[PDB]
Each structure stands twice: as C-alpha cells, then as structure tokens.
C-alpha cells in the first residue's frame, strides 16, 4: 500500500536567548523514526524508532553533519525573512518545512512536496508539477525569483523523484515488522444521566494502533451525525490511541442505539449497543 | 537521509 517519507524541519529564533532552536524530524507513514535537536545533550541525529538500530555509525555522523549544515542554513533564513518583511529583530519567529515523497505499491511516485511555513504560515511551496513555485505574499516572490533561478526546482525534484525514494524504500525494508503492525480497538459503551430524563452514552475506542479511525452512532439505521460529540483521537502513552463519540438520547430509547467502530485491525467493523 | 535545503 502507499507509503511515504516526510521530514519536519523547524527553527525558531531566540532574540536574547541564544542561537535559535532547529530540529529535524523524519517520518515513515507518520511514524517518527529519527530526529535531531539543536538543544539536546550534544545535538546529533538520533534513532527514534527502534528498527533504526540497524543503521551504522557512518549513517548518523552523516545525517548529523547534514543537520549541522541545514541548521546554519535556516539560521540565516531567519534574518532573510526579517528583511523581506522589514521586521524588528527583537521578537521571535519560526520556520517549518515539509519535505517528503509518496510512492505506490508499484514503486511509482504518487506525490512530491516541499512546504515552507513562517510563523505558522504558508510562505512558499513546490507545485505538484515538481517544477514551479507558489508564493504567498511579496516576501515569497523575492524568494521565488531567487529560488527558481539557481536551478532549485531541478535539484529538488531529483531528491523527491529519486533520493527520497531510494531511502523510503530502504527504511521500509528494515522496519516493516513494525510500521504496519496491527492493534485492535477495544470498545464498550457507558451510560450517563442528564436532566430532563435524557441521557448521554458515549462510545469508547481504546488500545488501538494505527490512529486513523471513524466511529459512529446510528438512528437504528440513519447517519446519526448532525448532532454529536467527538474528541480528536488521543495518544495513550504506550503507542496506542483512544477516542469516543456520543450524543443525548431519551431514556427507554438507549438500547435502540447502535455504535459502530471502524478500524483496519478489525476483521469486521464493531457494533456496540446499550 | 533528508534533503539539503538552499537559502530563502
């Protein structure tokens, strides 16, 4: 099935509090597996995911220095922006970037991205044609003319179309036993009193990995959606997640309500009823 | 390995 390798880069200026923080965090299927932090014991790319242990020393030192380079790189970027933006050094700002590629079960290349965000905002990004540029404001433009005219798109596309993929594939080969393992949700309902002789019953989904998952309540057949309660899935602590949905119902009607639980680790969706 | 970004 489709997979991907993204890299979340980030650097925040520290006007007064020393050299701004810069971080590099990679992800395979949104699974952090490796990171570098300018503010750790001794900044270095380190293995997050356990299967990374299969890479040797060269690997680390390599990315590590790469990091060190990229670090300085953005450090200046900070200034640059301040310039396009005529900002007062004083306050602090932030830069984040989305680097990654998506491949199919064939090995073909689904999509390639490069997203530049300043102070929680879209600054500039590579189109899907992996050749042009999309700016956001005056600033980005100056950054486009300049960017493009250095052959930027080209070298970028190389990585995406190629490097990115040689690795994404490599990683997978070493961490499949992990990556797409299965953890089944354990559900159950709970009934809660409420004034006016009504009630809320909320459906629980606990102990499940991955995290994507939809859950519903049904009008004994209809899409009981328009009026419910949902909570962004949440990280348990041991790699699993949790989530619940619910709504009010009149007493003596509970049992006439069905909850459904959809999760790729379920041989069949789940049906809860009070 | 991640890319090797170029200035803004």
């Amino acid at each position: 099935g489709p997979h991907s390798l993204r890299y979340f880069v980030t650097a925040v200026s520290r006007p007064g509090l020393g050299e701004p923080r810069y971080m590099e965090v990679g992800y395979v299927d949104d699974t952090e597996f490796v990171r570098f932090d300018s503010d750790a014991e001794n900044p270095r790319y380190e293995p997050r995911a356990r299967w990374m242990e299969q890479e040797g020393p060269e690997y680390w030192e390599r990315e590590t220095q790469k990091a060190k380079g990229n670090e300085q790189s953005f450090r200046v970027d900070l200034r640059t922006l301040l310039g396009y933006y005529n900002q007062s050094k004083g306050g602090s700002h932030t830069i984040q970037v989305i680097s990654g590629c998506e491949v199919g079960s064939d090995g073909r290349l689904l999509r390639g991205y490069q997203q530049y965000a300043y102070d929680g905002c879209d600054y500039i990004a590579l189109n899907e044609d992996l050749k042009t540029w999309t700016a956001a404001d005056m600033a980005a433009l100056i950054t486009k003319h300049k960017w493009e005219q250095a052959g930027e798109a080209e070298r970028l596309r190389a990585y995406l179309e190629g490097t990115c993929v040689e690795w994404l594939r490599r990683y997978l080969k070493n961490g499949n036993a992990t990556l797409l393992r299965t953890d089944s949700p354990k559900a159950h309902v709970t009934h809660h009193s409420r004034p006016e002789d009504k009630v809320t019953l909320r459906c629980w989904a606990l102990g499940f990995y991955p995290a994507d998952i939809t859950l519903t309540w049904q009008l004994n057949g209809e899409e009981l959606i328009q009026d419910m309660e949902l909570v962004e899935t949440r990280p348990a602590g041991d790699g699993t997640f949790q989530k619940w949905a619910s709504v009010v119902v009149p007493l003596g009607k509970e049992q006439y309500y069905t909850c459904h639980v959809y999760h790729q680790g379920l041989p069949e969706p789940l049906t809860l009823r009070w | 390995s991640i890319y090797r970004y170029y200035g803004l």
Partner: T-cell receptor
Amino acid sequence: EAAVTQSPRNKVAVTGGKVTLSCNQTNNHNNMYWYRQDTGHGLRLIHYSYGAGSTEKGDIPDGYKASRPSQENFSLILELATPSQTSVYFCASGGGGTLYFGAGTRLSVLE
Amino acid sequence: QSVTQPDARVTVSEGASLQLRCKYSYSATPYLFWYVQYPRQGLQLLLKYYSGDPVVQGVNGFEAEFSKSNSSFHLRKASVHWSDSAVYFCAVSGFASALTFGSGTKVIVLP
C-alpha cells in the same frame, strides 16, 4: 553574464603583509567560497558563506579570514602574510550545488 | 566526501576516445561533478550528477556514468579534438555545500 568577479587579479607583497582580495556577484547565489589552487592538491577550500553575516571555516582556514558583508560581496583576509600562502585563489558562488568560479588571483608572498 | 583521480596526466592522439577516471568514498550518494581548467581560465562546468540516471549528458561529447557499484563518475568522450586539451577536475559535494576536488587530470591531445 552568469559569472563571478574576483579582483585584484595579480598581487605580490612581503611577509607580514595584509591584503584584501575581493569579489563581486551578479547572480544572487547565497553561497560563496574561497578555494586555493596549488599543484599537488588541486583546489582546496578555506572559507565559504551562506550569505550576509555568514562565515564558516573550511579545510585550510589558519592564516585566513573570510568576510560576508553583503550577499553580493565576499572577500578573504590575511592579517599576517606568509610565502606559504603564495598561490592562485578563486572565490566561487553556488545556488545549490552548481558552483561558479571566478577569474582567479596571483598572490606571491615574497620575503 | 572524498574524491580521487588516479592519473594526474593523460596523453592521447587527436580524434580518439577519452578516459578520465574518478573514484570516491562516501557512505551515501554524494553529488558528482566535472570541471575543465584551460590556460588562463577559471574552472568551467561540464557535469553534475545529482541522482537518478547514472549516465549524464554534458556539453561537447562529454558524458560520465555514475557507479555506486564501484564508486565512480568517469567523464569519457569519443573523439577528443585539440581545443580540448586541458586539466579536468572531478568533484563531489555531500555534508555541506562546498565542493571537494581531486588532484585533477592533465590530458593532452596530440594533433
């Protein structure tokens, strides 16, 4: 155009000397370098810069001091000279990985 | 980020084929390049092989194939012709932006 200027072109001076071989830029590349061409080793890097205010060491920095005032200009310094330093330099820019070298410079450091 | 040209000086009859051999050591796939140094000139760009296809098509019969198999970016040609006698530099770029050159090769074309 598409190129990098590097002047003075030829320069000679006695030890202890101090010159400032400059370099201009008509190609908005952020990066900039200073290599040292000598027979036996080929080009060797001393100092490069990712833009204004940036100056990061290279492989042979001792005796040299780079300075990145403005995106366009990049220059090398040699407070105290030395005939060991006699050679042909080139500053170079490079918007990514495609470097662009300049004419060059003949500095002979006679005693 | 290392590079190594095994021969410092090559010589071949005009109109013949050319073999400029490079080698390197980098635990990954460093960027590869080929430059030409003429008489009173500055390095000129002939190639760059970022990734993908191991055979690059550069200006004037110059092409080089990359080879992770035996780590090498040899710039070769078919019928080298006089105006092409000069010094060629192989070059890589990994950890950081700057290039890393090899001693280089001095090939000569007997007309």
